[PDB]
Each structure stands twice: as structure tokens, then as C-alpha cells.
Amino acid sequence: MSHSMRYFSAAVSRPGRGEPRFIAMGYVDDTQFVRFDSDSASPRMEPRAPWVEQEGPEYWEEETRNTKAHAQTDRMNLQTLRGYYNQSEASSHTLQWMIGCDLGSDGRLIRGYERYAYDGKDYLALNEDLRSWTAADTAAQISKRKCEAANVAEQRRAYLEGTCVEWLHRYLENGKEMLQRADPPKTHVTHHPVFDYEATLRCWALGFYPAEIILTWQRDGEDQTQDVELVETRPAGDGTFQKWAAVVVPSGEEQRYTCHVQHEGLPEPLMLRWK
């Protein structure tokens, strides 16, 4: 039961349609708990999970204050990076950001993170040692040198080692029922004949939380990923996740295949077979 808190943001310029849009959002694991949107008509940091709504006005005032500061800083960063690449004022660009901490069963804090992406491309990252940066190209080297000279790593490390860890612990306690659950998947295998030579076996995992799951089909069983169709894990809409894994087998051959399911909410991992 590993846990993480992440803050993300996206600044998207739209020349000739106003200031760049800025969105920011915080997650614990796969649950969004906070959200800011500069297009809202009254931009502020807003609750997205019931357990954060018990924070008082000082918290919301400071989160809204800091996030507005970040919006303006990332709008400035869009301008700065447009120059580094010598791109035209008429063109649109995306600056994305991620900051976060991973705790570890115990503990605590196996990993801090901080990264920027520019137009979908890795730009600048804080290294695992949290004392040094990796820049993806020459433009980014300017940003890197600027962070080095201003000693910014130390300030990021202090948030990651201190504030990020402590508040993650707070949220995990306040939303214990939502966050420290482990809903196992409801699982079944469906059978889809093709007269009279083969059929498709589909292993379903449904209503599970968190997202991390592993489905695998095996014959005898000795495990074929190549012929397996595995969909991307998807949201149900009610907070839980879904996934399936399909394999086309020869007819009369179905009980030689078995589906393996591994997930935090399981006991003891699951083995399934069609009937």
C-alpha cells in the first residue's frame, strides 16, 4: 500500500484569445482532491474530494494565493521558453508541471519528484538525489543553470521532505475510508465462440481501487502477452477502475487457459478459468 501526493499544472497559450489558460490540481494516489482553473469566472483552488473540505479558510486562502502566483509564473515561463526556441507570438504552446512525493509502506518518503514538459517533451527534471537537475536539451540548460545559481534545489527538497510528506499523512488520515481502502476487483471470464474453430476469452476486472492492477492470460499455464489484447485501465465514473484482457483460443481448448489477477485488495492473487 504505497502512497503518493502529486500536484500538476498546465499552462496553454492561445494567442488572440486572451491570457494563457492555467489549470492546477492535486492528487492523493488516483483521487483528485483540489482544483484551480483560470477560466472558472472566479479562479480559486476548490475542493474535489469530501475529506479536504474540512480545511479552514486559511488553507484555502493560502492555496488559492500560491496557485495564482504559480499561474503568473508559468505564464512568464511560456514567454521565456518561446524566446529560447525562437517561436512566433502567433503560435500556441503547453507548459506542463508535476511535483510529488512517494512515502513507501513504511518508510517514509522513498521518492521526491519535480518535472516540467514543454509541448509534450521532457524539459527539466529534479534528479532523485533532489540536489541536481537533468535538462532535456540546450534551451533547458539555461533553466538548469539558473536553478543551480539560485540554489533552488534546496528549497524544493525542503517542500518534498517536509511539507509534502506531512500533508500526505494528514490527507490519508482525514480521507482514510476513501484513500486507504483497497476495493478488490469483481472478476469473471466471458466466452465468445466463432463456429466452430476458436473463441475469445475475455478476463474482466471491475470496480477496483486503486488503478494499479495486473491481468495476464496463461496456457498450461506458460503466459502469452503477444496475442493478448489488453485495454488501458479506465475510470468507471464512480471512483473505481476497470480493465480486461482477451485471448483467442482454439475451440474445445478453453479449460487449458487461466487468467491471473494481482491487485492490492486481493488476499492472495486470483486465478480464473471459463465455465
Partner: peptide
């Protein structure tokens, strides 16, 4: 709780 400032690039 988010960080106190963003990074100037």
C-alpha cells in the same frame, strides 16, 4: 498542500 512557489525557468 502545494509548494510555496513555482520555478522560474
Amino acid at each position: 498542500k502545494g509548494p510555496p512557489a513555482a520555478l522560474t525557468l
